[PDB]
Design a protein around this ligand. Structure first.
Ligand SMILES: [Zn+2]
Ligand SMILES: [Zn+2]
Ligand SMILES: [Zn+2]
Ligand SMILES: [Zn+2]
Lengths: 249, 249
């Protein structure tokens, strides 16, 4: 639109894109005109609520000193619009779609509350890598939450899976922070890149374990083992880069 | 004249115009004074009945919340006055002209009852394009009905033709609604204009097929094929407009 916010324009673009591709999918599926109209109106109804909630999150982030909350609200709206598109495409009635959207928003708030301290710690140390890791973890959690809500699961199983995912993310965050501090102090960008990449890998492993139904302890143990292997790789890379710098290479 | 209502003034103007041009046509044809007088009185007698019928229909529409019924009553009066003018020009006696006017009024009521649910559905979705489509369909139906009544056809062939025309109009309405919903939700007026234009084209095709004497199934099939072609054209236009909007063009 002509007059809006820097975060509202991106969400409007996402909404238009999702609406266009939802119409494309409905046309491909070969539905009647009234069914297409019902699906479009249902999608607009759900996406309006998702837009309101994400805009509230982004505004709350803008009021305080956390630029990460704006990006995380954008991620939330993207995945809420995605969930709304699948809800409209599946032919769910209005009541079930509204209930599913409410549960999705509540569980996204749960993940928000659990992830805020990591954002504060990352922004205290001025580490872009840690902020990117938190963004990636939120994105993966949103993916898992949307898939679980689509599959029709209870609010307790989803919370347990989120708890296991956060248990894994704690270890991933510790690994990334440990590598990134020494990478920034020694002035070697390769170490920071390695930290970010291997932290993303650890977050992916934690999410995959959480989806499989493992308890938080199992996720913690497996992520710790993978982090130990990646730490050996980091030791090798750090030695190589340090001796590249030391010899003038 | 003075006073009256908003809808009766336009009907009075139509009546005066038709009377004036009927007198011009009678003078051009070179008829005797008594023949001109009898044609004029016959036309006035038929047009008064048409005026009363259309005024009722318009009043019934105004009492409810359907502005479309007023416009369709005006359309009915216009074509009833046209039929009366042709009947007076042909020199038919009062009995045959009165019977023909009666049959025309009954068949216009038949078409009105068949078209009412589409008006209700269009008003429920608040779609000006669908209301315009219904108005156009009623206008074409009145044209065909006047032509058939002038041609001297029974009250069975006319009903069969009307059913075929309505069978085509169902597909035309579905196509127009399908395009119009997505055009309105994405806020692209070109899509709504395309919907209206191609729905009018489909209605014209359905009327042409009904005039030729085809069964409703053949009309349905042909209108469906033409709608598929127009749907491919709509897909092209929608992609072009969406990429114009997305790129800021
Ligand atoms: Zn709000
Ligand atoms: Zn370390
Ligand atoms: Zn009367
Ligand atoms: Zn379509």
């Amino acid at each position: 639109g002509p007059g809006g916010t820097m975060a509202a324009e991106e969400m409007e673009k996402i909404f238009r894109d999702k609406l266009f591709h939802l119409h494309q999918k409905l046309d491909e599926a070969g539905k009647s005109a009234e069914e297409i109209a019902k699906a479009v109106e249902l999608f607009v109804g759900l996406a309006m609520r998702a837009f309101d909630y994400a805009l509230h999150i982004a505004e709350r982030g803008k009021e305080m000193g956390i630029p990460t909350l704006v990006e995380m609200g954008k991620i939330l709206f993207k995945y809420g619009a995605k969930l709304a598109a699948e809800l409209a495409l599946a032919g769910k009635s209005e009541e079930e779609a509204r209930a599913a959207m409410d549960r999705f928003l509540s569980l996204s708030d749960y993940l928000l509350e659990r992830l805020l301290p990591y954002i504060e710690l990352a922004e205290r140390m001025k580490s872009p890598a840690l902020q990117e890791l938190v963004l990636y973890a939120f994105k993966e959690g949103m993916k898992l939450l949307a898939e679980l809500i689509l599959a029709g699961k209870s609010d307790e199983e989803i919370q347990a899976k989120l708890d296991a995912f956060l248990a894994g993310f704690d270890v991933a965050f510790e690994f990334t922070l440990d590598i990134d501090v020494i990478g920034r102090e020694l002035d070697i960008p390769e170490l920071v890149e390695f930290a970010l990449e291997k932290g993303k890998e650890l977050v992916k492993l934690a999410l995959e374990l959480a989806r499989a139904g493992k308890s938080p302890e199992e996720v913690k143990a497996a992520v710790k083992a993978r982090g130990e292997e990646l730490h050996k790789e980091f030791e090798k890379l750090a030695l190589k880069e340090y001796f590249k710098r030391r010899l003038g290479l």
